[PDB]
Write a protein that holds these residues in place. Structure first.
Motif, PDB file in Angstrom:
ATOM      1  N   UNK A  83       0.824  -1.198   0.000  1.00 32.45           N
ATOM      2  CA  UNK A  83       0.000   0.000   0.000  1.00 32.45           C
ATOM      3  C   UNK A  83       0.861   1.252   0.000  1.00 32.45           C
ATOM      4  N   UNK A  84       0.480   2.218  -0.828  1.00 32.30           N
ATOM      5  CA  UNK A  84       1.328   3.363  -1.059  1.00 32.30           C
ATOM      6  C   UNK A  84       0.496   4.603  -1.059  1.00 32.30           C
ATOM      7  N   UNK A  85       0.942   5.598  -0.308  1.00 32.80           N
ATOM      8  CA  UNK A  85       0.341   6.916  -0.303  1.00 32.80           C
ATOM      9  C   UNK A  85       0.846   7.708  -1.505  1.00 32.80           C
ATOM     10  N   UNK A  86       0.005   8.576  -2.077  1.00 38.36           N
ATOM     11  CA  UNK A  86       0.529   9.494  -3.092  1.00 38.36           C
ATOM     12  C   UNK A  86       1.211  10.704  -2.451  1.00 38.36           C
ATOM     13  N   UNK A  87       2.190  11.293  -3.131  1.00 37.55           N
ATOM     14  CA  UNK A  87       2.873  12.457  -2.597  1.00 37.55           C
ATOM     15  C   UNK A  87       3.727  12.257  -1.346  1.00 37.55           C
ATOM     16  N   UNK A  88       3.696  13.260  -0.470  1.00 38.20           N
ATOM     17  CA  UNK A  88       4.507  13.252   0.739  1.00 38.20           C
ATOM     18  C   UNK A  88       3.739  12.738   1.964  1.00 38.20           C
ATOM     19  N   UNK A  89       4.421  11.953   2.802  1.00 39.17           N
ATOM     20  CA  UNK A  89       3.830  11.309   3.975  1.00 39.17           C
ATOM     21  C   UNK A  89       4.777  11.468   5.158  1.00 39.17           C
ATOM     22  N   UNK A  90       4.240  11.841   6.319  1.00 38.25           N
ATOM     23  CA  UNK A  90       5.077  11.994   7.492  1.00 38.25           C
ATOM     24  C   UNK A  90       5.114  10.730   8.332  1.00 38.25           C
ATOM     25  N   UNK A  91       6.273  10.099   8.445  1.00 41.17           N
ATOM     26  CA  UNK A  91       6.364   9.042   9.426  1.00 41.17           C
ATOM     27  C   UNK A  91       6.824   9.627  10.735  1.00 41.17           C
ATOM     28  N   UNK A  92       6.016   9.424  11.759  1.00 42.92           N
ATOM     29  CA  UNK A  92       6.256  10.033  13.047  1.00 42.92           C
ATOM     30  C   UNK A  92       6.517   8.912  14.025  1.00 42.92           C
ATOM     31  N   UNK A  93       7.776   8.738  14.433  1.00 45.74           N
ATOM     32  CA  UNK A  93       8.153   7.589  15.243  1.00 45.74           C
ATOM     33  C   UNK A  93       7.984   7.877  16.728  1.00 45.74           C
ATOM     34  N   UNK A  94       7.378   6.947  17.469  1.00 45.94           N
ATOM     35  CA  UNK A  94       7.097   7.164  18.886  1.00 45.94           C
ATOM     36  C   UNK A  94       7.924   6.353  19.853  1.00 45.94           C
ATOM     37  N   UNK A  95       8.369   7.015  20.911  1.00 42.63           N
ATOM     38  CA  UNK A  95       9.186   6.407  21.960  1.00 42.63           C
ATOM     39  C   UNK A  95       8.361   5.626  22.978  1.00 42.63           C
ATOM     40  N   UNK A  96       7.050   5.850  23.011  1.00 42.93           N
ATOM     41  CA  UNK A  96       6.154   5.134  23.914  1.00 42.93           C
ATOM     42  C   UNK A  96       4.824   4.808  23.251  1.00 42.93           C
TER      43      UNK A  96
END
Length: 477
Positions: A83-96
């Motif tokens: 599965x693929x998003x079009x354009x730009x995507x923010x991956x936001x990594x979480x510590x908890x």
């Protein structure tokens, strides 16, 4: 603040961001047309805060979530899609992974559900760095280098979906298809071709050769009576219920020729020679305990089911071993090993509407020993169990759990796949609670102050029993 829950070093914006998602039979053609939030149910999560489409960076991990949900142990496997998003995507990594901490430190409404906020325009503009939508990233599982991805349901509507593989299309028997796919993660490995095996085995049920238990210790005799003792009429005429049954038995290692931490039924022929012998003893074992259970059973369903188990424990020994050494004091019983991963896991704090997580390491001394499931404490409105977030990780493989409330205010959890442990195969039981209300608890609404891990099935004074190891926690402060 944001820096106390978010990890910048693994957070990023990428174009055409992609992941893999496992698909259950009857949907592999359907979801390529778009992903939409299912009709009410499992939701992606029990916890309101975690509703969403889940994916991973690893197509072998997603694969394992494709088996029919009505037949988790023996059932068919659909496929894996990309599965693929079009354009730009923010991956936001979480510590908890506590949804209340996040909401505080990220300055969010402590009112509304996390994954609900995550999908809003205003959240995206505030965390997205122009990336059109946010996706949360988290470690996939202990023993795993993988990454779990959490997509907001509404925002996930823009995914474009491609077939990566359809397991059904490939037209094989059992789950041969799926395990062949997973064995690709190995560039020593142990990849067995399994129709060359299944046919080469019922050709060896003659009526009236070249194997040697040098080196091994484990023998056949016990298994067969053990087997013939569990299967009633209704079980033997069901492959799923059959597999569950054999899944919780001791001494399976002796058919499989597994001991000392090595797969000694190495070749297509050594294995083929072994299962065959198993089949007949079991056939010869039913006219001692089970009624009209047909000896065809020992030729058909028994064989179909045992093959499957060879495939689970093979898949396990192909994965790296999770770090064995308990880092806390182990409880031994019936040949197992159970230990809090860290002292802090063994404390259940209160004064929370929020959630908690707990890790128990499980080991075994030599030969593959099943884990029947786990027993959990329950206070109806002060201490609930998170169905979705509780799982068991076996050398990196995240096995999701089915959870029904037995009660007295105590909850049970079955793995949705066979779990075995042993020399070189270790597991992490991860437990998660969710408290509707932050009311109070002293151990005067708990009935038991332990977490019970259930092992193999056993016969004592002629009655059916699971070997139980408890682990004691402490509800204080």
């Amino acid at each position: 603040g944001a820096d106390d829950v978010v990890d910048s070093s693994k957070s990023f914006v990428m174009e055409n961001f992609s992941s893999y998602h496992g698909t259950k039979p009857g949907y592999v053609d359907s979801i390529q047309k778009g992903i939409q939030k299912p009709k009410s149910g499992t939701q992606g999560n029990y916890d309101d805060d975690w509703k969403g489409f889940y994916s991973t960076d690893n197509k072998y991990d997603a694969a394992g979530y494709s088996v029919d949900n009505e037949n988790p142990l023996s059932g068919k496997a659909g496929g894996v899609v990309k599965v693929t998003y079009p354009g730009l995507t923010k991956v936001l990594a979480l510590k908890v992974d506590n949804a209340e901490t996040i909401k505080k430190e990220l300055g969010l409404s402590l009112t509304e559900p996390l994954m609900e906020q995550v999908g809003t325009e205003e959240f995206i503009k505030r965390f997205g760095d122009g990336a059109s939508r946010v996706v949360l990233s988290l470690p996939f599982a202990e023993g795993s280098s993988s990454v779990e991805y959490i997509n907001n349901w509404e925002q996930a509507k823009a995914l474009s979906v491609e077939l990566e593989i359809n397991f059904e299309t490939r037209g094989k028997r059992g789950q041969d298809a799926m395990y062949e796919y997973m064995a690709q993660a190995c560039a020593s490995c142990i990849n067995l071709d399994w129709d060359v095996i299944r046919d080469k085995t019922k050709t060896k049920i003659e009526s009236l050769t070249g194997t040697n238990p040098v080196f091994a210790g484990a023998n056949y005799a016990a298994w067969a009576v053990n087997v013939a003792q569990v299967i009633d009429s209704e079980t033997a005429d069901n492959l799923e219920k059959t597999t569950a049954a054999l899944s919780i038995l001791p001494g399976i290692g002796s058919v499989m020729g597994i001991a000392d931490g090595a797969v000694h039924h190495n070749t297509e022929e050594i294995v083929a020679q072994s299962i065959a012998l198993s089949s007949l003893m079991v056939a010869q074992a039913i006219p001692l305990v089970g009624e009209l259970v047909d000896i065809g059973f020992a030729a058909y369903n028994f064989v179909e089911s045992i093959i499957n188990l060879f495939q689970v424990v093979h898949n396990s020994y192909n994965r790296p071993a999770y770090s064995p050494g308990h880092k806390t004091q182990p409880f031994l019983h019936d040949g197992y090993a159970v230990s809090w991963n860290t002292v802090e896991d063994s404390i259940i704090r209160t004064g929370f509407q929020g959630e908690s997580g707990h890790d128990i390491k499980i080991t075994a001394e030599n030969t593959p020993l099943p884990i029947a499931g786990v027993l959990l404490p329950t206070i109806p409105g002060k201490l609930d169990v998170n169905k979705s977030k509780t799982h068991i990780s076996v050398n990196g493989r995240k096995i999701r759990m089915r959870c029904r409330a037995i009660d007295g205010d105590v909850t049970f959890c079955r793995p949705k796949s066979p779990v075995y442990v042993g020399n070189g195969v270790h597991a992490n039981l991860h437990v998660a609670f969710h408290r509707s209300s932050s009311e109070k608890i002293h151990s005067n609404e708990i009935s038991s102050d332990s977490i019970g891990v259930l092992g193999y099935q056993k016969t004592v004074d002629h009655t059916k029993v699971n070997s139980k190891l408890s682990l004691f926690f402490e509800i204080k402060s």
